[PDB]
Amino acid sequence: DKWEMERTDITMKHKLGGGQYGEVYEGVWKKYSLTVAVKTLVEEFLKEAAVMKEIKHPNLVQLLGVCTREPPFYIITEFMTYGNLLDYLRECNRQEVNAVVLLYMATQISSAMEYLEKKNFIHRDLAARNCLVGENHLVKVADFGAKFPIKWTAPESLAYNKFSIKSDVWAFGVLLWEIATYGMSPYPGIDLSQVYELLEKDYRMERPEGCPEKVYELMRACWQWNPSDRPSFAEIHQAFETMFQESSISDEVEKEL
Amino acid sequence: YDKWEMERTDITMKHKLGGGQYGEVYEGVWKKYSLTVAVKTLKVEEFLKEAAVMKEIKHPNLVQLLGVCTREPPFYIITEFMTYGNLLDYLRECNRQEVNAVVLLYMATQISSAMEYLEKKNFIHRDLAARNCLVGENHLVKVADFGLSRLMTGDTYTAHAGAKFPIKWTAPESLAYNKFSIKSDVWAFGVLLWEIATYGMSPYPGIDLSQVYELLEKDYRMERPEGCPEKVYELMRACWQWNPSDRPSFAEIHQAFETMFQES
Ligand SMILES: Cc1ccc(NC(=O)c2ccc(CN3CCN(C)CC3)cc2)cc1Nc1nccc(-c2cccnc2)n1
Ligand SMILES: Cc1ccc(NC(=O)c2ccc(CN3CCN(C)CC3)cc2)cc1Nc1nccc(-c2cccnc2)n1
Ligand SMILES: CC(=O)NC1=NN(c2ccc(Cl)c(Cl)c2)CC1
Ligand SMILES: CC(=O)NC1=NN(c2ccc(Cl)c(Cl)c2)CC1
């Protein structure tokens, strides 16, 4: 189909970010001299390729082409010039990447998730390490990959192996906490083998330093024990666009002073 | 239909805002931009007079009209939604180490900037108070007018001159001769300043409404509240000059806050 391209069109450079993403390489799509990202390799691979042709949205990593006729196989996406969000936040300049920016990043991510909610997709591994940063603080959600990230995992997935858009809502709340702490690890110091029983007894992380009340209110809503008591991503996204607009106006008033 | 008219199906109506706190105002969604909005509904000339007034007011610190639905009943007036609600309850509930002196200065500055605009456009507010302001993310403050004398029960509004007045916000010339002007808004702003410095205490605490007029005419004024800076208290007092023409203009008040805010 339209997405198939010759492996010759791509100059495969070297493996991306010290291989921390696995078999994903920096590449050059030669006809356009365009730096791209290339996943190489089995039927899960083709399933991923099949899914990525079905999703398009400003804040989801954009598929550019595939190579699926003979090995080795390629999934080709855009290259995001600032890398993954967790490392960005951990190394950023906090006076440039300030509260208006942090809010902008959460708004974009909730936008991607509302889109996946709308098309009935589930993410299953939402976290800062799975998001990418471009120019102008553009953020796009991606998915790089008995092995959980327990600290991002909703109670019904720990206990019953049930995943849903609502367990992505749970993980979105933890991602908010990652943003608010510029990429600290959640539940600081807490034995991850006791997290399930702590959650069952209504333990949650306290508001991190500097986090706005309403953002923390949304985190706590994301962390409701019942999946059905959690907000939809449409509700979360609406709350963030409304906040982001208020914050942008306040930012301009402040500059004008 | 003019340029503000919007199709009803552009809005998802969700539920009464504050559950009826504000009367026939609903929380809604402007779907195409994923924005929460406030929607005022007619359960008529006065309704459309309000919409017409708001079509002339565009300022960062005033509530912004987004559209109206006037093709068939029920009629809608649509504005933005402010995440943190009204300023009075916000001040009463906030975390004071987060909402500190510089944020209070910032909120007063934004409110004075909105009133300077109303002054320049020759509008009068007539009911300026913390309960009529809204707070948004990143300490945004916007001035609104909810028509609260109709909705609010309690001692805030009391009968006077065949009307309802917030006595403790009302300038003397308005209490006495029912005369309202931008200078009686300047009086109310001084009281609003005192609401801010006290994180939302009721003005003239412990003094009965029956006493307020006589006290003000005999030159009583509220004391500087604990922690309020002296130059901010000086502005309050200038706002509470007995003769309306001795009160400062909102242009002057905003300039004074501008200067203060950048020295901090
Ligand atoms: C090279 C590649 C191959 C495949 C993918 N795929 C995805 O990112 C993805 C996102 C969402 C889904 C949707 N899916 C639906 C169902 N559930 C279960 C899972 C998610 C699937 C794949 C991305 C990439 N891009 C990628 N990968 C790793 C690193 C980088 C990268 C690193 C640094 C700078 N720029 C880019 N870029
Ligand atoms: C939905 C609506 C419809 C109309 C209005 N109108 C005004 O706010 C207003 C402000 C200034 C004037 C100027 N006017 C000029 C002269 N006269 C004398 C008085 C003032 C007129 C109307 C607001 C709203 N918004 C509104 N109403 C109630 C509650 C809320 C609300 C509550 C919580 C969070 N966010 C929003 N929001
Ligand atoms: C160290 C520090 O002060 N962090 C604070 N986090 N803020 C924040 C703003 C918007 C969002 Cl969405 C989130 Cl999650 C957090 C503001 C500043
Ligand atoms: C309880 C308490 O300490 N209140 C004080 N109010 N201050 C204040 C600063 C600027 C302005 Cl414009 C205003 Cl109105 C008040 C600072 C702190």
Side-chain angles (χ1 to χ4, degrees), chain A residues 99-100 103 114 207 211-215 237-239 241-251 253-254 256-257, chain B residues 14 29 33-36 60-61 80-84 95 98 106 109-110 136-140 142 254 258 261-262:
Chain A
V100 187
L103 184 65
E114 174 185 27
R207 197 176 54 86
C211 173
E213 287 309 324
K214 176 74 178 177
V215 173
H237 180 219
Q238 290 155 22
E241 291 285 355
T242 305
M243 272 185 276
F244 179 48
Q245 180 188 288
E246 293 151 12
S247 189
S248 293
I249 296 164
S250 188
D251 198 60
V253 162
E254 268 161 13
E256 182 65 39
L257 280 175
Chain B
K14 279 209 313 219
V29 189
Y33 295 116
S34 290
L35 276 173
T36 310
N61 303 109
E80 65 200 323
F81 180 96
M82 290 286 263
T83 296
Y84 286 90
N95 162 11
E98 173 200 320
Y106 183 47
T109 302
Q110 296 175 84
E137 196 43 77
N138 200 15
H139 307 309
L140 182 53
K142 282 167 171 274
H254 186 257
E258 262 216 343
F261 179 83
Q262 57 208 26

Side-chain angles (χ1 to χ4, degrees), chain A residues 26-69 71-117 119-125:
Chain A
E26 157 164 3
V28 180
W29 185 0
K30 282 176 253 188
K31 180 195 174 124
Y32 306 92
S33 311
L34 181 76
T35 298
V36 303
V38 196
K39 205 181 188 209
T40 76
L41 173 134
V42 47
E43 183 79 45
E44 227 76 72
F45 192 102
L46 281 312
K47 174 61 171 244
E48 170 168 16
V51 162
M52 297 183 58
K53 313 180 197 192
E54 277 178 43
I55 48 190
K56 182 150 64 159
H57 183 277
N59 303 107
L60 283 175
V61 65
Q62 182 54 60
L63 173 71
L64 295 184
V66 292
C67 301
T68 67
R69 276 315 191 304
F73 312 98
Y74 289 162
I75 298 167
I76 310 144
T77 71
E78 70 190 308
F79 186 81
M80 296 299 282
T81 49
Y82 290 89
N84 77 78
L85 178 57
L86 185 67
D87 289 335
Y88 184 81
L89 289 167
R90 279 176 178 171
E91 313 176 331
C92 70
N93 161 41
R94 298 203 185 170
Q95 263 87 35
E96 188 208 346
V97 187
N98 68 3
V100 187
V101 179
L102 297 186
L103 184 65
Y104 181 47
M105 296 176 333
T107 309
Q108 286 167 92
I109 297 180
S110 70
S111 196
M113 291 317 295
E114 174 185 27
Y115 168 88
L116 292 185
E117 179 169 85
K119 323 251 82 157
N120 309 315
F121 285 112
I122 298 134
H123 188 288
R124 296 184 49 140
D125 195 27

Side-chain angles (χ1 to χ4, degrees), chain B residues 96 101 104-105 108 193-194 196-199 226-229 232 236 257:
Chain B
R96 288 192 191 184
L104 304 180
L105 183 58
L193 254 49
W194 185 100
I196 287 172
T198 65
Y199 286 87
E226 199 195 341
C228 174
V232 173
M236 281 189 221
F257 281 123

Side-chain angles (χ1 to χ4, degrees), chain B residues 6-70 72-137:
Chain B
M6 63 183 302
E7 279 293 312
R8 205 177 295 277
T9 48
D10 277 6
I11 299 299
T12 301
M13 299 290 286
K14 279 209 313 219
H15 62 77
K16 255 171 224 173
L17 205 165
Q21 187 182 339
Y22 296 98
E24 283 299 307
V25 174
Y26 292 82
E27 192 180 297
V29 189
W30 196 6
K31 299 191 270 183
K32 67 173 61 163
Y33 295 116
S34 290
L35 276 173
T36 310
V37 294
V39 187
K40 181 165 159 176
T41 300
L42 214 46
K43 187 231 201 156
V44 198
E45 31 199 272
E46 301 239 28
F47 192 82
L48 300 175
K49 184 52 210 133
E50 179 177 10
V53 170
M54 299 171 70
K55 295 174 203 197
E56 316 207 331
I57 296 157
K58 176 151 62 64
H59 186 271
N61 303 109
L62 279 143
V63 61
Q64 180 52 60
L65 176 68
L66 304 173
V68 301
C69 307
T70 58
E72 45 185 288
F75 287 167
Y76 285 176
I77 292 168
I78 309 289
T79 72
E80 65 200 323
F81 180 96
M82 290 286 263
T83 296
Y84 286 90
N86 79 85
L87 174 62
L88 180 58
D89 294 311
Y90 179 82
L91 285 163
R92 290 175 172 171
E93 282 134 41
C94 72
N95 162 11
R96 288 192 191 184
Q97 284 68 50
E98 173 200 320
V99 181
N100 59 7
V102 76
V103 174
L104 304 180
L105 183 58
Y106 183 47
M107 292 182 331
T109 302
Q110 296 175 84
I111 295 170
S112 79
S113 164
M115 298 301 310
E116 168 184 14
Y117 177 92
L118 286 198
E119 164 181 281
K120 186 187 232 203
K121 313 256 310 200
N122 282 290
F123 284 110
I124 302 158
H125 190 295
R126 302 206 343 155
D127 190 13
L128 181 65
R131 62 196 174 262
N132 264 327
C133 295
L134 290 167
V135 175
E137 196 43 77

